[PDB]
Amino acid sequence: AAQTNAPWGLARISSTSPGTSTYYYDESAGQGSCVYVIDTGIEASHPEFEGRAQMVKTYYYSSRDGNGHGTHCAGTVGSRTYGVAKKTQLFGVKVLDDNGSGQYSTIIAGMDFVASDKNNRNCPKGVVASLSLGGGYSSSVNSAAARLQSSGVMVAVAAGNNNADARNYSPASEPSVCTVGASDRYDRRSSFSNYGSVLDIFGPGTDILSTWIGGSTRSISGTSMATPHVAGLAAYLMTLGKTTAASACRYIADTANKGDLSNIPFGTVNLLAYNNYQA
Template sequence: MRVATRRLLQAAAVATGVGAAAVAVPLLAEPESVSVQVAANGTPVPGQYIVTLKPGASTSAESGRIGAADVKRFDGVLNAFSARLTAGQLAALRKNGRVAAIEQDQIVKTSTVQRSPLPWNLDRIDQRSLPLSKSYSYRRDGRGVTAYVIDTGIAAGHPQFGKRARSVWSAPRFKGDGRDHNGHGTHVAGIIGAAHHGVAKGVQLRSLRVLDEYGSGSMSDVIAAARWLRLNAARPSVANLSLTGNRSKAANDAIAALSRSGVFVTTAAGNDGDDACRYSPAGAPLAFTVGATDSADRRAGWSNVGKCVELHAPGKGIRSTWLGGGSRVADGTSMAAPHAAGTAALFLSHRPKVGFLELQKWLIDTSTKGKVRGLPAGARNRLLYKGGL
């Protein structure tokens, strides 16, 4: 759904549009000090920082040396940790030669807007041209593939999920509660794999909850989720992040590491009508970033653009699963990205051992060219197409 991408790290759903604040890129350590990068246009988490270390340095040793509180270590996906730091602890880390970069943690937030029904999106991705054929044809359903949704959680008991959905991880602040109290994650999961609304109707759905009932969370929790997934994901698998924030090198590096581990990562481009490369995880290397179109193949005016956007997919007026066992219509690049995740799951059910680059190439090569209207000059004109899957 469309999520507000302003000054926050946010779920990239434009069901009102997930927006994200642009966190400035962390500076590399200088000989004797490290600059602290604060989200000038974002919403910082007071007193909380993400500290990236140089190769060979230990996250446990460096966080323990200064007595940091609320430490989350990201070993396995990123040589970094997040913690609450006093001014003195922060000053000590800035002078620490083993520290590569420090970013202030930032908020993630999503909001949604209910709209009138417009169930057109599945129909669009199984044909090359308009008008719509009023049908969705498929030979595969994603069986044997696991789709991970890093979001607000999933309402696992929704009848469209059958017994295919459950929570596998949630940020520590939720104390083990992986349920969706917002609706955004359930909507995203439904586009990927609900029995009626989903692209891959037989895929296993797994939730990693990083956002609360208000659709708010932190970038450090997103990195922690990526770490857990890199260490524990089933194969073959895809992971969808319908959230976005200002550019964060730490987050981008974590997402790239997750992709290299064999999990195909799809991300929302963001809903600021801006350059997607300025945001995270949309600008991450080895992330498959997706912009949004409407039912007339027009680029949504709020959809981010630029060289980091691989292709576009339906993202306006998308009906999918919601809390309470029902459905809701929403807009956003948050809705576009899971169409690509579902299509990737269909492909992996056929060829389970392909890596990120091969699957990325297939999605790009198979996409319908030249159909998206309203793109700026030089933009890649590609529309998601699932081929004969």
């Protein structure tokens, strides 16, 4: 399938070169998979989600996304126009308040929630969790991410936006999950992207158009935007049967575009997420 005039990041993930604008992908489109977006919520009523998104858990007075960040990330996973995996099921877990903040204890509870809640959902092709959040190093936060991954969920986490080594941030620093840095449309490391040995992969993260609250759209930047590209890619590849939740990060690294990004510090992987779809 071909989506013309796609957001640059979608075109990038199906291309061996920057500078194109059509996204190519197998029409299975993540059907039968599920992606949890652990964030500020999801505006499930947005026409872009086509009834495929729902809130399943909140720790606050509402499950609605009063911020936009979670809706934007969910849109990059799975919206019809802005999403990588256009037929996946999206499940929102609101661990962040409408200011975008959350206590680590709530975030940990949300990860353990997903590890159990997947057993209440129909995801025959597999389960992914996208975590566009983080703070300073916490062994307990890393352990929660490791448990979620161990339970059979492909965990993708943001590297962070500090232009620093991600070893000092959580859950970015957890070895067993997929830690995602950000790149721009010219294949440069995003100016804010964390780096370091703990990163597994880069995805598009600068000037990413996606859904927003109030039935709208906007373009924003962050490792928060790169992470759902990788989460959606994992769901798409799991639906194709090419990989599993336990192996998808490694498979994405195996099959990435290699050596094409600029300003990658010595010791950080030079790997850009790529679907290897041959139309």
